[PDB]
Amino acid sequence: EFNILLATDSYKVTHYKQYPPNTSKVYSYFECREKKKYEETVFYGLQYILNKYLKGKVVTKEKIQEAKDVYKEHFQDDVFNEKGWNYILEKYDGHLPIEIKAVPEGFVIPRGNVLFTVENTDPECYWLTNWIETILVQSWYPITVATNSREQKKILAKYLLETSGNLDGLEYKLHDFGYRGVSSQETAGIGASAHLVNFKGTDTVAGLALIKKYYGTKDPVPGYSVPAAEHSTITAWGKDHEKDAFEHIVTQFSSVPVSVVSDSYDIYNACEKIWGEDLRHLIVSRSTQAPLIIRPDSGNPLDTVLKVLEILGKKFPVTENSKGYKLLPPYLRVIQGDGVDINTLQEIVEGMKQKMWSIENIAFGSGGGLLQKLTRDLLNCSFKCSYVVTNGLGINVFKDPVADPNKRSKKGRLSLHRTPAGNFVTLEEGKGDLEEYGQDLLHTVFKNGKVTKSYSFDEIRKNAQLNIELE
Amino acid sequence: EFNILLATDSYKVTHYKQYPPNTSKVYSYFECREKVKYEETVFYGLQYILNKYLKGKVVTKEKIQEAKDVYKEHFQDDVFNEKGWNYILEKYDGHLPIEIKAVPEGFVIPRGNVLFTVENTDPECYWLTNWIETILVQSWYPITVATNSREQKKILAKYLLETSGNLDGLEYKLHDFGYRGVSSQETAGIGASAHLVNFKGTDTVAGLALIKKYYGTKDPVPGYSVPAAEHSTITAWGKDHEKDAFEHIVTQFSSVPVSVVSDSYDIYNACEKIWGEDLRHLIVSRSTQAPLIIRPDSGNPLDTVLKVLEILGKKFPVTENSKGYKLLPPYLRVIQGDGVDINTLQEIVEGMKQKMWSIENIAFGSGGGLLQKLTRDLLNCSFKCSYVVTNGLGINVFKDPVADPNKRSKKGRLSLHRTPAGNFVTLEEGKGDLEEYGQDLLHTVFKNGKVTKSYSFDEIRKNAQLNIEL
Ligand SMILES: CC(=O)Nc1ccc(NC(=O)C2CC2)cc1
Ligand SMILES: CC(=O)Nc1ccc(NC(=O)C2CC2)cc1
């Protein structure tokens, strides 16, 4: 069973002996720090952490004893705020005396703005604000996945609109194949749910359950998939029988869309000879609601995609759309699911555009690039103390390392506001109290062990829409 | 509650309909495919997966119904193999009819060798082998952390041995600060445990419990930490009171080691004037068992370490060790916990060596670089079918993409062997049965719902030792 007393950076266990004596309040904030591109970030994932880990009776006698026993061996010393944890158990029935205020989930906010703040609601628990830094900072992950996923959506929308004249199917153009490429089951669910803020396609089922339990959607599920082969279901037929495997699978799945990996031995032979000749009669007969989707999975991603389209365009009837771009027949599409990240995604669609291929023709799958090849440094996700009260006097605190101005932190009590031009500004030093900038956009979401404001996944999706979708 | 019917890639739900008719056996294997350079990998972490997710009754009526309802909406179609899962429920009381063979955990094996194999033990459950690919493939993560952690130990060992003449304290030279920098609580525990294969220092508490539950150590805990400041415990005193903060903290922790972040405003001032002058009397009085450990945390990592050392060298009595390298007094050390990954670690220790500073003087902390900035591509961790039986005939299967020879997979039944020179070789096409290469080095670790062979964390550590330690 999860124990919040064991869910912090070890050294934090020792911090109740380090703050200035007579400190009644520690107030800290989280930002995606500006770095001297990722100019705006989707705020998502806090509500999961609040419900799964922080809410309700999270302290018990047994949990305190367990922690005491572990830390004694871990430190080879007795340092551990047993009294402090007892106080929360006795006075608040194990509920964290903490208030967290946050921007609504789904909101898209420029770098360098306060996204949430944390403070203790009882003077005795001044040490608790930063105890829970470790667990709260892990919000960097769904924030970064949602943000990086949204940025790939911008690229797709731009090129889809240019080559086709509309955005139809945009929400299916980047599929999550990341289940096997992430570091754990829990990461898989969190990461999949963050991708679903922006798209509807995922093969990692864990994302669905998480969304239902922690956020909720009107639709039965937030995510979808279609029948698809892997290399094992082709190669199991034997090297001389790829055609047989192909024929079997497309016939099994004759009325739904079907993805078939085509590069087991020779992707170009498979497209030109097998699909394009031997089995062409099983492809051209297919419904528009059930195309064959050809899946290359090796080689230079751009070069392979172009050569695959070139091959197919000579074997199947291609049309030219109203924008001047070439379009495969509706029963035939391509998915590139190898080597895809935000950099290569851009290179592929631009390369397709150069060769006059509509983005209508293709969709993308991303695994490690989508859910694993990301770090806290990408958006400089960071949690810092900005305000303390000591001897009843509030003081604005901050770091400002001489060798790195980029690591300077904000001062005092913070608030987030709309500017007169409609942008965002973070006010420091309690200047929000002057009320010159309209309402603070941060809302209380957690207070004294209870979740006080929640968002549905439908609202979050609405908040995270692209401008191009809006327009 | 975790449901293994829902812990696969969505598309694998439809695979029982895609294999050749009358297939009775699917046999697959995992390798770190040969292409840095990461020539050898530590095999670690399968035992966690076996126990937490695969063993015992993993199928119930409720889990079957649950997955049915989920997949119906997910595919917008009824495609779930309800009958197959019911067969396992009814026949084997929900225990998986699967056999897994694996190299011992902690083993250091060159790239391109079979590390584990998977096959169904019941003909009806031919589809089961690749259903669990997704869960088993996540072993890439502990393998890669452990391997990358060990590669850094190799670097530290070389430079420590060169500058000091021994390896004393090596196991504490790379400390895990990755708890906040990983993608989840579960990942934190797994990765920390993998780091602990090589080192004893971690602030990621979750690692200890994982090891205790799934592996076990003779000692009460496998990892240790020491009291340390963060920016909030320095800055909370106010910008004009950094000295007061330093004095309070080193006085509170006067007889244990204490790490004190010193770059809140001006690292160089902090070292030269605050520590080196104002509070010097509180530092030179400390025990060898309780040093002050000064922690810079910003600026170019190499330049910052070198300047911090030059500053301290002029304020405190420096000795020259037997190898001719400079050594701070035993009550004073440094930890660099910013910008550290396998690349910069190398640059820092080489830079220290060039300036005649012993590696004894320093330790490193790494977070995202240690536990998060790694992918399945680093070691090319990959799971592939190599052998099937269809119509009673065994077939050696494989992929071999024309535009990428690096993606070619192995053929047939596999086994791992010791060569005449004492190295590892993987034999394909069932050739291990010819008995020209001695016994198979893989062991059966899982069979029909039971873990059949396991390793303590102490055994794993021993297996993973560096040659220089041996
Ligand atoms: C629009 C589209 O192409 N969707 C789509 C295509 C393929 C897959 N799935 C696969 O290709 C799996 C085998 C990897 C999922 C959605
Ligand atoms: C040998 C050594 O220097 N160990 C060591 C030093 C510092 C810390 N911990 C910290 O510096 C925490 C503040 C980040 C842990 C172990």
From Swiss-Prot, chain A:
Organism: Homo sapiens (Human)
Primary location recorded for the protein, binned into one broad class: nucleus
Localisation per UniProt entry: Nucleus; Cytoplasm; Secreted
Keyword Nucleus: yes
CDD domains according to UniProt: PBEF_like
Activity regulation, short description: Inhibited by FK866. FK866 competes for the same binding site as nicotinamide, but due to its very low dissociation rate, it is essentially an irreversible inhibitor.
Family affiliation: Belongs to the NAPRTase family.
Annotated consequence of substituting R295D: Reduces activity towards nicotinamide
The reaction(s) this protein catalyses: beta-nicotinamide D-ribonucleotide + diphosphate = 5-phospho-alpha-D-ribose 1-diphosphate + nicotinamide + H(+)
Pathway: Cofactor biosynthesis; NAD(+) biosynthesis; nicotinamide D-ribonucleotide from 5-phospho-alpha-D-ribose 1-diphosphate and nicotinamide: step 1/1
Tissue specificity comment: Expressed in large amounts in bone marrow, liver tissue, and muscle. Also present in heart, placenta, lung, and kidney tissues.
Entry's Gene Ontology BP terms: cell-cell signaling; circadian regulation of gene expression; inflammatory response; NAD biosynthetic process; positive regulation of canonical NF-kappaB signal transduction; positive regulation of cell population proliferation; positive regulation of ERK1 and ERK2 cascade; positive regulation of gene expression
InterPro entries given in the database record: Aldolase_TIM (IPR013785), DUF5598 (IPR041529), N/Namide_PRibTrfase (IPR041525), Nicotinamide_PRibTrfase (IPR016471), Nicotinate_pribotase-like_C (IPR036068)
Superkingdom of this protein's organism: Eukaryota
Keyword flag Secreted: yes
Pfam families: NAMPT_N, NAPRTase
The protein's name in its UniProt record: Nicotinamide phosphoribosyltransferase
Reported function: Catalyzes the condensation of nicotinamide with 5-phosphoribosyl-1-pyrophosphate to yield nicotinamide mononucleotide, an intermediate in the biosynthesis of NAD. It is the rate limiting component in the mammalian NAD biosynthesis pathway. The secreted form behaves both as a cytokine with immunomodulating properties and an adipokine with anti-diabetic properties, it has no enzymatic activity, partly because of lack of activation by ATP, which has a low level in extracellular space and plasma. Plays a role in the modulation of circadian clock function.
Modified residues (Phosphoserine): S456
GO-annotated molecular function: cytokine activity; identical protein binding; nicotinamide phosphoribosyltransferase activity
Enzyme class: transferase
